Amino acid sequence: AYVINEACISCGACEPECPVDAISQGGSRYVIDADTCIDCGACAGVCPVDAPVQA
């Protein structure tokens, strides 16, 4: 699983780019469903602040 850390500015650009639709808008920051994420790294590639990190 990847996890979106506190650098997230909630721009929303990663949500459409997740191939398995694991990302959604949350309170404060976007969130990854760890039971769906397959570690492709696509969300970090479109993140301007590089908030998604592999855990």
CB 2 within 8 A of CB 35: no
Q: Distance between CA atoms of 49 and 36, rounded to whole angstroms?
A: 23
26 is in an annotated binding site: no
26 forms part of the interface with ligand SF4 (CB under 6 A): no
Q: Distance between CA atoms of 36 and 48, rounded to whole angstroms?
A: 23
39 forms part of the interface with ligand SF4 (CB under 6 A): yes
55 is in an annotated binding site: no
14 is in an annotated binding site: yes
53 forms part of the interface with ligand SF4 (CB under 6 A): no
41 forms part of the interface with ligand SF4 (CB under 6 A): yes
